[PDB]
């Protein structure tokens, strides 16, 4: 039996476990510039992965979503990084990566 069949055979619904991590980045550029720098960095580091820059300026790596929070302090950008448990390894990897900042 598969995992969804084994759920449906017991009448159960899937439980969504979701994480949103508030990543802080120092950047005095406009947040949109920051999001672009984040996109370029991740596209370079994760070359094997689907990495996108969406028309609203948000960034994704497979199904992990990275968005600007609402503008704060002018030199601190908050990047809300969100993923479900399906992408747990990728999600923790990305929040760990961004702890080291961005290319100069």
């Amino acid at each position: 039996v598969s995992s969804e069949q084994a759920l449906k055979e017991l009448g159960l619904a899937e439980h969504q476990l979701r994480f949103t991590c508030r990543v802080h980045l120092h950047d005095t550029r406009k947040e949109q510039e920051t999001a672009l720098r984040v996109y370029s960095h991740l596209k370079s580091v994760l070359k094997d992965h689907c990495v996108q820059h969406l028309p609203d300026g948000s960034v994704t790596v497979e199904s992990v979503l990275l968005q600007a929070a609402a503008p704060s302090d002018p030199g601190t950008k908050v990047l809300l990084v969100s993923w479900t448990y399906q992408d747990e390894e990728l999600g923790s990897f990305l929040t760990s990566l961004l702890k080291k900042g961005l290319p100069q």
């Binding site: 995992s3 969804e4 084994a6 759920l7 159960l12 619904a13 899937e14 439980h15 969504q16 476990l17 979701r18 994480f19 949103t20 991590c21 508030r22 990543v23 802080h24 448990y85 399906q86 992408d87 747990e88 390894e89 923790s92 929040t95 760990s96 961004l98 702890k99």
Partner: protein, 77 residues
């Protein structure tokens, strides 16, 4: 990773948070669920039917701790 199902009873969850060294835990009610509030990494844990959402600052050791306790209340498929 496996599919998850099940429920997180908020009383029990809080009790296990205490067992694991968390104190000063605060709990809000929502229309049918709850939010657990922790000072550590300014964390909210939104507890709803078939939905748990952990929102916290970038404190990976804290996040992993909460992740693990939430998973102990769920079944893995």
């Amino acid at each position: 990773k496996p599919l998850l199902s099940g429920s997180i009873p908020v009383e029990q969850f809080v009790q296990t948070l205490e067992k694991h060294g968390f104190s000063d835990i605060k709990v809000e009610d929502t229309a049918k669920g709850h939010i657990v509030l922790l000072q550590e990494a300014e964390t909210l844990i939104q507890i709803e039917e078939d939905s748990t959402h952990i929102i916290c600052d970038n404190d990976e050791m804290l996040r992993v701790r909460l992740r693990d306790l939430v998973l102990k209340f769920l079944q893995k498929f």
